[PDB]
Design a protein around this ligand. Structure first.
Ligand SMILES: CCN(CC)C(=O)[C@H]1CCCN(c2cc(-c3c(N)nn4cccnc34)ncn2)C1
Length: 284
C-alpha cells in the first residue's frame, strides 16, 4: 500500500541521523490519519541515496518485536522512509526523564530486548555498527526497539567481518579496538558496543558519566581530533575500561567487561547474552 506525498502533514521535527520527522498520513483530510515517522536524507547525492536505498532494503527485510516497523516508502528520485511512530521517544531521553523511577529489573527488561533484536539481526548476517541508546526507541513502559539502521552493513559471502575503507561519521567511543585500528566490523564488534550500551543504561544516561566524558578524562581532555583515536587505541590495548556504574550490581558489570574483551573470539554471543540476562531477571 502506497504513501502519497501530498497527504504527509508535518507535525514536528524529531531529530538528526537524514532527518526524522513526526507526520500525519492523512489521505482523508480530517486529521484522523495515522501518526508515523518519516526519515528523509538531508543531502541526497548519488552515493548517499544508494546508501539510503540499501538501508531501506535492510529494514524492510527485518521483522521482530524489538526492531522498529517498516511501513513503506514515499516517492517523488527522492526517498522518504515511513516507519511506525514510537510514542515514548528516544531511550536516552526516556531514561533521563524517569531517572530512578526505573529500577534494575526494568532496565534488564530493556537489556534483554535490545539483545534479542541484535541476535535476530545476526541471523541475516547484518552488522549494526552503531548500537547506542540514542538509536533505541521506546514504544511503552514494557518495550523498546532498535530504531535506526543508517550504518548497518551486510557481511560479504566468504568473510565474517567487513572493512569500511573510507569512514564517515564514527561513534568511536562505542568502537571495538579492531574497528579503531583497522575498520573491521563484525558481530563481535557489535557485542563490544552492546557492552557500552549496558553501561549507558546503568548510568541512567547521566551526561557527566557518559562514555565520551569518561574516556576523555582517562586519556586527558587536552586530546583533540585524530589524537583522541591514537590515545584511545593505546588506552584500550592496556585494559583501560569504563568504570563500574554507581549502584550497578556485580553480575551486570561482569557482562560489560566480557563484552570489552580485546580478543574478539572470546566475547560472548548475543545468543548467550539473552539467556544470561533472562536468568538474572528471573533470579531477582
Ligand atoms: C534512532 C533514530 N535516529 C536516526 C539515527 C535519531 O537520530 C534519533 C536520535 C535523536 C532523537 N530522535 C528521535 C526519534 C524519535 C522516533 C520516534 N518517536 N519514533 N521513531 C521511529 C523511527 C525513527 N525515529 C523515531 N523520537 C524522538 N526522537 C532521532
Amino acid at each position: 500500500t502506497q504513501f502519497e506525498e501530498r497527504h504527509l502533514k508535518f507535525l514536528q521535527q524529531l531529530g538528526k541521523g537524514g532527518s526524522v520527522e513526526m507526520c500525519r498520513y492523512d489521505p482523508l483530510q480530517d486529521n484522523t490519519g495515522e501518526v508515523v515517522a518519516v526519515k528523509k536524507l538531508q543531502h541526497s547525492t548519488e552515493e548517499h541515496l544508494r546508501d539510503f536505498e540499501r538501508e531501506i532494503e535492510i529494514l524492510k527485510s527485518l521483522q521482530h518485536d524489538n526492531i522498529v516497523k517498516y511501513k513503506g516508502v514515499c516517492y517523488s528520485r527522492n526517498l522518504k522512509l515511513i516507519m511506525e511512530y514510537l510514542p515514548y521517544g528516544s531511550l536516552r531521553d526516556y531514561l533521563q526523564k524517569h531517572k530512578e523511577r526505573i529500577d534494575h529489573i526494568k532496565l534488564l527488561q530493556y537489556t534483554s530486548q535490545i539483545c534479542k533484536g541484535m541476535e535476530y539481526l545476526g541471523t541475516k548476517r547484518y552488522i549494526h555498527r552503531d548500537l547506542a541508546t540514542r538509536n533505541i526507541l521506546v514504544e511503552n513502559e514494557n518495550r523498546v526497539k532498535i530504531g535506526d539502521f543508517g550504518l548497518t552493513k551486510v557481511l560479504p559471502q566468504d568473510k565474517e567481518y567487513y572493512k569500511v575503507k573510507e569512514p564517515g561519521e564514527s561513534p568511536i567511543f562505542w568502537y571495538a579496538p579492531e574497528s579503531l585500528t583497522e575498520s573491521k566490523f563484525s558481530v563481535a564488534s557489535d557485542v563490544w558496543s552492546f557492552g557500552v550500551v549496558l553501561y549507558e543504561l546503568f548510568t541512567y544516561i547521566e551526561k557527566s558519566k557518559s562514555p565520551p566524558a569518561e574516556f576523555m578524562r582517562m586519556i586527558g581532555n587536552d586530546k583533540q581530533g585524530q589524537m583522541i583515536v591514537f590515545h584511545l587505541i593505546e588506552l584500550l590495548k592496556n585494559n583501560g575500561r569504563l568504570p563500574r556504574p554507581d549502584g550497578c550490581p556485580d553480575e551486570i558489570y561482569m557482562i560489560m567487561t566480557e563484552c570489552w574483551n580485546n580478543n574478539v573470539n572470546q566475547r560472548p554471543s548475543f545468543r548467550d547474552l539473552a539467556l544470561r540476562v533472562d536468568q538474572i531477571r528471573d533470579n531477582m
